[PDB]
Amino acid sequence: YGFQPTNGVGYQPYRVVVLSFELLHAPATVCGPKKSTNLVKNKCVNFNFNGLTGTGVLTESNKKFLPFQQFGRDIADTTDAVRDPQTLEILDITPCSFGGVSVITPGTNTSNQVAVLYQDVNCTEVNVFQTRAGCLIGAEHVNNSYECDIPIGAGICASYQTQS
């Protein structure tokens, strides 16, 4: 080619690059970037660390892995810790609060009032009274002791007095 700067287009030089992706039969190789995000702690999230996928609340911990160890698991083989691949810090994983809901009724033939127990849940995550059976809403905590009427649990009972 005798290229010259005063050539009409279609006679000027073009540079060409041909990318050819091949897939022999190895175990893996080059791939595209892996988008990420920030680190939100103390909230129920859907996390994903490298392929470790789950949901829960992440806190900072007092464990010490071994430099090659990437995540921890306990008896019954559930993941209860992880290492994040950029800070090199290990984080505790705690399932996001759950429980049952029970309603305490003084009998519909006596009233329409009810109280509600959220079983083994701290009261912040739902007048309001904290037992060892859970968080109880809609019942007043008196100081006298009667015979048990409706069993709440761990030593606490409820009853319809006087009207409440």
């Binding site: 690059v17 080059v30 970037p33 892996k34 988008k35 990420s36 995000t37 920030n38 680190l39 939100v40 909230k43 129920c44 999230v45 859907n46 996390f47 994903n48 660390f49 490298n50 949901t55 994040d84 691949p85 950029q86 996001c96 609060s97 759950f98 429980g99 049952g100 809901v101 029970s102 309603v103 305490i104 009724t105 003084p106 009998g107 519909t108 033939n109 006596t110 009810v114 127990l117 959220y118 849940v121 995550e125 009427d149 409706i150 069993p151 709440i152 409820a158 319809y160």
Partner: protein
């Protein structure tokens, strides 16, 4: 809810399990390592000759 789970318009005094409860995930996060091998295509696409 009690009347639904008991299948009755009357209920008697007691404590009744009616439903479950659980907290929902606020958002989603993704994590991996830094980047040291993003390939420097500025040699084949940026050659002098």
């Amino acid at each position: 809810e009690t009347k639904c789970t008991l299948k009755s318009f009357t209920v008697e005094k007691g404590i009744y399990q009616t439903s479950n409860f659980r907290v929902q995930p606020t958002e989603s996060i993704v994590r991996f390592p830094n980047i040291t091998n993003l390939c420097p295509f500025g040699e084949v696409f940026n050659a002098t000759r």
